[PDB]
Scaffold this motif. Structure first.
Motif, mmCIF file in Angstrom:
data_model
loop_
_atom_site.group_PDB
_atom_site.id
_atom_site.type_symbol
_atom_site.label_atom_id
_atom_site.label_comp_id
_atom_site.label_asym_id
_atom_site.label_seq_id
_atom_site.Cartn_x
_atom_site.Cartn_y
_atom_site.Cartn_z
ATOM 1 N N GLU A 25 20.822 26.394 2.614
ATOM 2 C CA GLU A 25 20.846 25.946 3.998
ATOM 3 C C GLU A 25 19.423 25.934 4.536
ATOM 4 O O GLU A 25 18.657 26.873 4.302
ATOM 5 C CB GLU A 25 21.734 26.854 4.843
ATOM 6 C CG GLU A 25 23.092 27.184 4.228
ATOM 7 C CD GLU A 25 23.747 26.004 3.531
ATOM 8 O OE1 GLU A 25 23.740 24.887 4.094
ATOM 9 O OE2 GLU A 25 24.272 26.196 2.415
ATOM 10 N N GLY A 26 19.067 24.871 5.243
ATOM 11 C CA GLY A 26 17.738 24.748 5.809
ATOM 12 C C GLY A 26 17.616 23.405 6.484
ATOM 13 O O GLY A 26 18.552 22.601 6.481
ATOM 14 N N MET B 169 29.684 29.895 12.343
ATOM 15 C CA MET B 169 29.167 29.311 13.572
ATOM 16 C C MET B 169 28.407 28.016 13.310
ATOM 17 O O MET B 169 28.468 27.090 14.130
ATOM 18 C CB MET B 169 28.283 30.301 14.345
ATOM 19 C CG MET B 169 27.518 31.339 13.551
ATOM 20 S SD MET B 169 26.266 32.058 14.638
ATOM 21 C CE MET B 169 25.247 32.976 13.495
ATOM 22 N N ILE B 170 27.710 27.916 12.178
ATOM 23 C CA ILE B 170 27.134 26.635 11.782
ATOM 24 C C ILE B 170 28.229 25.585 11.687
ATOM 25 O O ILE B 170 28.059 24.435 12.119
ATOM 26 C CB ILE B 170 26.368 26.781 10.455
ATOM 27 C CG1 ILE B 170 25.095 27.591 10.679
ATOM 28 C CG2 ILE B 170 26.014 25.420 9.874
ATOM 29 C CD1 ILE B 170 24.491 28.137 9.412
ATOM 30 N N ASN B 171 29.386 25.969 11.148
ATOM 31 C CA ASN B 171 30.487 25.021 11.059
ATOM 32 C C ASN B 171 31.000 24.622 12.438
ATOM 33 O O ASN B 171 31.298 23.444 12.668
ATOM 34 C CB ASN B 171 31.623 25.582 10.207
ATOM 35 C CG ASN B 171 31.153 26.073 8.856
ATOM 36 O OD1 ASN B 171 31.487 27.180 8.440
ATOM 37 N ND2 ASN B 171 30.365 25.256 8.166
ATOM 38 N N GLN B 172 31.175 25.588 13.328
ATOM 39 C CA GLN B 172 31.756 25.203 14.607
ATOM 40 C C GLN B 172 30.792 24.274 15.313
ATOM 41 O O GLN B 172 31.193 23.292 15.902
ATOM 42 C CB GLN B 172 32.228 26.380 15.467
ATOM 43 C CG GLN B 172 31.249 27.500 15.725
ATOM 44 C CD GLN B 172 30.519 27.362 17.043
ATOM 45 O OE1 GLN B 172 31.140 27.237 18.096
ATOM 46 N NE2 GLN B 172 29.193 27.383 16.991
ATOM 47 N N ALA C 220 23.431 15.345 10.279
ATOM 48 C CA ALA C 220 22.969 15.299 8.897
ATOM 49 C C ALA C 220 21.932 16.380 8.626
ATOM 50 O O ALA C 220 21.960 17.020 7.570
ATOM 51 C CB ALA C 220 22.401 13.917 8.582
ATOM 52 N N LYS C 221 21.017 16.601 9.571
ATOM 53 C CA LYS C 221 20.005 17.636 9.390
ATOM 54 C C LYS C 221 20.637 19.017 9.277
ATOM 55 O O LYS C 221 20.208 19.838 8.459
ATOM 56 C CB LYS C 221 19.001 17.598 10.540
ATOM 57 C CG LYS C 221 17.946 16.509 10.407
ATOM 58 C CD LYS C 221 16.941 16.532 11.554
ATOM 59 C CE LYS C 221 16.900 17.881 12.256
ATOM 60 N NZ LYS C 221 15.653 18.058 13.050
ATOM 61 N N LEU C 222 21.653 19.294 10.096
ATOM 62 C CA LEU C 222 22.254 20.624 10.088
ATOM 63 C C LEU C 222 23.190 20.819 8.898
ATOM 64 O O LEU C 222 23.338 21.939 8.399
ATOM 65 C CB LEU C 222 22.989 20.869 11.406
ATOM 66 C CG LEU C 222 23.791 22.164 11.556
ATOM 67 C CD1 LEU C 222 23.546 22.768 12.926
ATOM 68 C CD2 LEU C 222 25.275 21.912 11.347
ATOM 69 N N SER C 223 23.821 19.745 8.418
ATOM 70 C CA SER C 223 24.878 19.893 7.423
ATOM 71 C C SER C 223 24.418 19.621 5.994
ATOM 72 O O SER C 223 25.043 20.108 5.047
ATOM 73 C CB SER C 223 26.041 18.959 7.763
ATOM 74 O OG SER C 223 26.593 19.276 9.028
#
Lengths: 528, 528, 528, 75
Positions: free
Chosen positions: C190-191, C340-343, C370-373
């Motif tokens: 993750e990054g 929380m990343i998912n929510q 896209a950047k977060l996932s």
């Protein structure tokens, strides 16, 4: 040969430097209070001169382009002095002024051609005004007064002149010679003049005035081109036997013939002179016939198939004296009998009657009739000592040349005030361009320099004197500055006048040469 | 001897410097408003000239390579001036423009050969256009008008010219001589011309025009090579006894013979001239026979085994006058009887009838028949004074040479507008290469300089005037700038025209010499 | 201050001298057979380099105007190298060629603006042709082959690369880090990355690549402008107590705040870095919120009225590592919980559904989703020794940057033959003027230099090789010179290819800078 | 010869010496700036002149290369 070329501003600057040097040297001698110039000779005491033409003739510059400009102005000044009698200093000053002002205006970004047009228009206007304001002299008393003024107040010279030109007319021939006594003599003789001078400068025997004088010489008149010496040998031998000088009046003397004549003259073998026959065409033959009749000799013509080796002293012409200058020559006291001169006059008038050409042939016959019949007035200058005779002779010659010019066109107030007063008519011209007006202003500014320089030579400030003359007394054309007495007043009443001819010639020649110098765009000299 | 060599860009730069100096000096004298050039003499007054050829002939540079370029351009300009009559300034200007532009394009990285090809194609197109647009003059009224225009509006000169060339034809011989009277004379005499001039420049007796003139001379016609003086001695002695000038028309005069002739001529012993016999082969012998018949003498031929020491004055030829130039010589008023000239004409026409060669022999016999039978028109210039006669003679000669050129090819509008208008046809050429288009553009840019320079000499800006001419009034080939009146309009209506011959010759010669200078890759001079 | 000014030809000549020196120094390193450059250090052994950018970055000239030209070209070359990955030498060579040819054509008398128009038209035509002839790579096998070729035939590197970009996609984030073992590892973590780098160059800790690397740092996210140190003191003290490096992601760090951070970092007190918050407007706040969620910390906002002195290590963000470059920064292995990343992802997709703006808001939400996932692919480089690990890491980084460029636009044959073959399409352009044609010819001539220089570095004659390539085999776009084996043949078959992106960028930038240099008319520097 | 025509002599020579290797009469026509059989176009020269030029140039060049001392006169 290798050349050096200058274009545009730099060449004109060099020419202006040369003209500036020449004008600065010559201007100090203008006016009654002109300064002195010291000229150094290679060997001998230095020469002190107040004469403008003498100073001008002795200036040569080391730089080629400045010398070129100075030479051009010197040639123009010499030509106007020869044509009119005087005006070298005024012409040089006007040339310098107009050339400098035109150079300045061209540098300012003006069209030189329109400057030339404006200068021409202004000069024409000035000449018209001066001709309108001139004073004509006709009767004998005014001629006597003019000659007296031209002789520095000498009444005897003025009386003598006014009489010679009474006898021969205004257009007659008057000459001045040395006398045998103390009192002054005026005699009417037979003689005549032509507009052809000597072939080579080396023939000059009187280097003081650059002329040739012979007393009772032998005259050889031939209608031939002479270049071989075999034809001349009998004539030269006959002259050597009689111990008399020889003058040959031919169609032309060229080739080895002239050289033989020159070396003979330079040495003591025989003194000789050569001139070309006057006129061209059948007029030349008729004039040679008239002159052969007058001189008592016979003309030699190939149409008569008579050879020059047949020459005998009987056919040689003889006369009282001959005088040869650069332009004119004059024969005096011919040995021809009176009766044949008269009959020839009768044939001349008969030909005048018969001739059909209204203008050309009639006027030429009339002119040669006048030349043959008028005679010559001779003024024999008398004195106690030789030097007195010589100096009085020179004074009489100078006073004679000025009266003629004044009799031709008139007199205008002197001191440079004629041109200064004429400057007031230039404010009525209507040029078609801005640059033509600039040229008119150039002429208007330049035509004030002679009075300024005359006042400066007197020790005053020329600008202030000119302003005083040009500000008040605006209804007096004859009002100006008497520099000799440092006064103001009517210059004509004080006898300060100059001929219109000399001032007009100086103005025209200076304007023309200055315009030519301004127009010049390239100058070529030789690499040292 | 030791040499200095320059290769490539530096040699071309030196040549360009020389051509630049020459063109800059010559261009200031082009147009009605051309400026003045001052040329300094080693001794004497400076010379003021507005003449392009006079300025060009007096330029020599110190640097060897620049002098080489200037000399090349001077030779080409002199050759075109001699061939056509005028065009030195235009040829020099065009040479400078084309050479400078070609140097720039070569420096830009272009092929000089393709530049040459494009320049040739453009010049051919311009010549074709100019020939298409020329105006031919045939009848006498147009010849009279052209001669009047060429004489600065002189109607008498135009009327006199149009008549001489009416009498002798357009291709006839017309010459100008001094007259004995005031009115102008036109007389048809017997005489003839050859294309062979004098052997040595030293034979010139009239240095003003570099020609030789003899009145009633003795003619020696010989079909021999003369180098020993023993054969010449009897002829020279017979000439010296009769006191008449001698002209020798031989196969060749070389060796010590010419030198003896020269020194004799330079001194006063005898004046002599030498020319080579016209033609080559049997044509030379036939022409010498015709000329011996015409001149009243006899020809000397080894095939007849007659020696030159047998010469007697009976066999010597005599004529009214002879005039010798660099290229042509003309005999006038031969002493031959009319009847034998006629019979010889009869043999000439009989040989024309008999000759089988359709082109060569027939045309040569026809040409010599025309030479023997046509005669010569002589214009005797009359005047009052000698100087008037001389100046009018020069004006008449100039007005004559221009009418001939105009009668040959036609006239095109002057002021430099013919080439300027011809520049509009160059945008239809299809070059095969890029560099050929660059050469076409070089020619197109260069062919605008004469009008620009003419406008510049008037004081205006040449570029703006050219742009105004080239922008509007696009349906008028005769529309341009009158620099004399500073106006715009039809130049042909104002009489500003020039012959097509001179402009074509100037264009061709300038293009050729500029291409040759551009192609040059090495230059060799001498070390100082 | 006092300045020096150069106008026109002289200033352009000085600029051309500078560009000439720079291009001559850089060109020797182009091609497989590039020569060596010796660069001298003030203290230490001399550096031997075959790298064009290294040589270019170490050139400074003493003369001011030449240095100005060299600096301009250096800036453009550095910019194109940074944008595309490579192409400094080619861009410099093309700049020199176009600038020199344009200077020559301008000196020849041409219009620079039409030259610029023709150059632009030719460049557009070349770019269109190259884009038409490019080879696109889509599937994994072609990506693997391209990466293997870019790795000098290394199959392991090509296999590793083709997989990372299989996992994250062509547009994903792939980074290279040092490994702990011998075998090579590929891990998805993750990054996320932003396009904002470090505030001050001094923050660089790895001077080899000019980047900053921190392992497990503390992150301070604030929506504030920080300039006073009192707000930073609690955060800095908390960092000092935990002995961990600090990264501050703020709106801006200016004033005394940055200076305090720098001196602290330069000394051993604490190592810190500062970057600006990504995006602008409400997008910046939303991105900072997403990043605060990911990093496990909390964002500080004045709209929430929370002060920086309230900061406690609980609200500080933590992550596995951070890497900061000039342009981009990347956070790796954030400490946020997965749930929380998912929510947050769910709210992002809900906002995508709700948002009404079709283009702007939807695409921005999609990009941040896209950047977060997407996650980040990390390649851990394994090896036996430390130096082996470092050199293999550098090789892997280089082979990675080239595959991306090839995946973006494609590949064209290498060796400089792509531009050489593209020169054959310029003979179909139709300019509206001859000067535009001159510009087209300038581009056509200039686009042959890279192949000539590559052949010259091999020891051959580049002109002859280029002529051989451009004369025969005219139906083979892939045919050229293999300089490594000194052979001729299909370059693509031998693996000599380069990305279209780098050649297009080099061509465009060189053309633009050369046109700008040609157009320059005045240059101002400082007086020494 | 190619340089005088305005071209680059090295490239022309390379083109002649690379392809058309079975044609002794194949070369560059500089007058027409073309390639082809020169004998067909009438561009030939005698063997005598080329042989003499080659032999004399080779001999004089070898003699100049072998020279070890040169003596002239002081200016």
């Amino acid at each position: 040969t290798h050349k050096e070329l200058k274009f545009g501003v730099e060449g004109r600057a060099s020419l202006l430097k040369g003209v500036d040097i020449l004008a600065k040297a010559v201007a100090v001698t203008l006016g009654p209070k002109g300064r002195n110039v010291l000229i150094e000779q290679p060997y001998g005491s230095p020469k002190i001169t107040k004469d403008g033409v003498t100073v001008a003739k002795s200036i040569s510059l080391k730089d080629k382009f400045e010398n070129l400009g100075a030479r051009l102005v010197q040639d123009v000044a010499n030509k106007t002095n020869e044509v009119a009698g005087d005006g070298t200093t005024t012409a040089t000053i006007l040339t310098r002024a107009i050339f400098a002002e035109g150079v300045k205006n061209v540098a300012a970004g003006c069209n030189p051609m329109d400057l030339r047009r404006g200068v021409q228009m202004a000069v024409d206007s000035i000449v018209k005004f001066l001709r309108e304001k001139s004073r004509v002299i006709t009767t004998s008393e005014e001629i006597a007064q003019v000659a007296t003024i031209s002789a520095n107040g000498d009444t005897h010279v003025g009386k003598l002149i006014a009489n010679a030109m009474e006898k021969v007319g205004k257009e007659g021939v008057i000459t001045v010679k040395e006398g045998k006594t103390i009192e002054d003599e005026l005699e009417i003789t037979e003689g005549m003049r032509f507009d052809r001078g000597y072939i080579s400068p080396y023939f000059i025997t009187d280097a003081k005035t650059q002329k040739v004088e012979f007393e009772k010489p032998l005259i050889l008149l031939t209608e031939k081109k002479i270049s071989i010496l075999q034809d001349i040998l009998p004539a030269l031998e006959t002259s050597s036997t009689q111990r008399r000088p020889l003058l040959i009046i031919a169609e032309d003397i060229d080739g080895e013939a002239l050289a033989a004549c020159i070396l003979n003259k330079l040495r003591g073998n025989l003194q000789v002179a050569a001139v070309k026959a006057p006129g061209f065409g059948d007029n030349r033959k008729s004039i040679l016939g008239d002159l052969a009749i007058l001189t008592g000799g016979t003309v030699f013509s190939d149409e008569l198939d008579i050879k020059l080796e047949r020459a005998t002293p009987d056919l040689f012409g003889s006369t009282g004296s001959v005088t040869i200058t650069k332009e004119d020559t004059i024969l005096l006291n011919g040995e021809g009998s009176k009766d044949m001169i008269n009959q020839r006059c009768e044939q001349i008038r008969a030909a005048i009657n018969d001739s059909s050409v209204s203008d050309y042939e009639r006027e030429k016959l009339q002119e040669r009739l006048a030349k043959l019949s008028g005679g010559v007035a001779v003024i024999k200058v008398g004195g106690s000592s030789e030097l007195e005779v010589g100096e009085k002779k020179d004074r009489f010659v100078d006073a004679l040349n000025a009266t003629r010019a004044a009799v031709e066109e008139g007199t205008v107030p002197g001191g440079g005030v004629a041109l200064l007063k004429s400057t007031k008519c230039l404010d009525k011209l209507t040029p078609g361009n801005f640059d033509q007006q600039l040229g008119i202003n150039i002429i208007k500014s330049a035509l004030q320099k002679p009075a300024k320089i005359i006042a400066d030579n007197a020790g005053e400030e020329g600008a202030v004197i000119v302003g005083k003359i040009l500000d008040n007394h605006t209804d007096d054309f004859n009002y100006g500055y008497d520099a000799a007495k440092s006064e103001y007043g009517d210059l004509v009443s004080r006898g300060i006048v100059d001929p219109l001819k000399v001032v007009r010639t100086a103005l025209v020649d200076a304007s023309g040469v200055a315009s030519l110098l301004t127009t010049t765009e390239c100058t070529i000299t030789e690499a040292p």
